[PDB]
Design a protein around this ligand. Structure first.
Ligand SMILES: Nc1ccn([C@@H]2O[C@H](COP(=O)(O)OP(=O)(O)OC[C@@H](O)[C@@H](O)[C@@H](O)CO)[C@@H](O)[C@H]2O)c(=O)n1
Lengths: 233, 236
């Protein structure tokens, strides 16, 4: 079975790491979250489309689904976790308690504020997860990537041809993801913020699926202004 | 003395069509290169502002400057090189053969196809080059960065808080740039995608100056749609 996990944990402020509900901001007279969900409802192969969000946003999420006539029976809103990977695991646990996890199940996890992913991206994610167990959506780096350990000076400049900008979806065989996450120590769980890095850190391969330049994360006022252009055109 | 080097030397190859150089494409009825140049003209302290273009585009560039009533005597259009760092060094050599290089000279090198840099970015680049000798214009990485050695599977996912997207300008003390570049082999030069790595590879510091989310590089039709939005929105 194939599941979608829509991660609506918000976008943390720079000071304080306060979750801001950017997925509710308006994009051409409809919340960003609704645009993203519409893309997933178009995929008939999903058994459930699970939105995980902080307890304090669950009612507004349900109210917004109702206002924008999103009635698809596969949509469910559940409470998120203490960080992004813990929220993913809340989704996995919800699947297990509801249907039970099958050996061939896959989960397609995706940012609520990435409304411009495509049918191809979703299908390629599903197929790569079924065959290989773990997948990241990426695009080739356009800028030269540089590192710094002090926010003052360059530490290194890697070869750009080996660098990729990570997007989402990130998709996994569910049992593989669960087994890998179970291998991490409490310290690792506190430090890891990315879902594909769970797999990498536990020495299993992660496949690349190529995204799109326009599959942006709408997290700043600048990105919201750009998003209006992408949508209208 | 302070010099600007506007890098307009690439050629936009297209499959099955006449090459259309991205730096000359119209953006709100004005070529991208002119948008970029206007920012540099507003900096009084440049001694010269040198635009490098492919040989066959030099006359067209000079004429287009005249078309937009741009007569600034500091502007010179010269021939670029076969790769980006060769274009930068063509500009350095032109300065050397024209004025000679002073020990305190700095050069602000910048993509012609990045029209949305700001007064602040240029001024911080100049000051950074004067104080530290080498500087990169960067922003915090917008995405998690992923690496791959086989172009099929992830090799590593570095700690995201140490990752930055390189933009331009990149600015240098001229003698430092020249001396560092002279140390590199042809293979080392082949691997470079920017100028600041010349400095990093020769074990001299490169300082960071913050760019902007809208200091985008215009190279594909998608980027031009974004550029048009930026202009109409007053974002930059
Ligand atoms: N023979 C050449 C080739 C290119 N050029 C100029 O170079 C500009 C960017 O060129 P291009 O769009 O192809 O981008 P690159 O792949 O070179 O990488 C750049 C990336 O490193 C940098 O922006 C940033 O990230 C660093 O921090 C364009 O104006 C070209 O005309 C030149 O004058 N002569």
């Amino acid at each position: 079975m194939k599941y979608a996990g829509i991660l609506a944990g918000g976008i943390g402020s720079r000071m304080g790491n306060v979750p801001l509900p950017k997925q509710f901001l308006d994009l051409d007279n409809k919340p960003i979250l609704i645009h993203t969900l519409e893309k997933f409802i178009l995929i008939n192969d999903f058994e459930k489309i699970i939105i995980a969000t902080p307890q304090q946003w669950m009612t507004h999420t349900k109210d917004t689904l109702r206002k924008f006539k999103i009635s698809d029976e596969r949509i469910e809103v559940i409470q998120g976790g203490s960080d992004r990977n813990d929220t993913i695991m809340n989704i996995v646990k919800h699947i297990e308690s509801t249907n039970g996890i099958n050996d061939d199940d896959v989960i397609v996890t995706h940012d609520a504020v990435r409304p411009f992913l495509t049918h191809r991206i979703i299908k390629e994610n599903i197929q790569a997860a079924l065959e290989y167990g773990a997948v990241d959506t990426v695009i080739d780096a356009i800028d030269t990537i540089v590192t710094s350990k002090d926010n003052q000076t360059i530490d290194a400049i890697p070869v750009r041809n080996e660098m990729y900008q990570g997007q989402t979806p990130q998709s996994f065989n569910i049992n593989l993801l669960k087994e890998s996450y179970a291998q991490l120590s409490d310290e690792q769980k506190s430090i890891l913020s990315d879902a594909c890095k769970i797999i990498v850190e536990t020495n299993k391969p992660v496949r690349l699926v190529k995204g799109e330049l326009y599959n942006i994360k709408v997290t700043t006022p600048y990105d919201l202004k750009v998003a209006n252009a992408i949508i209208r055109g």
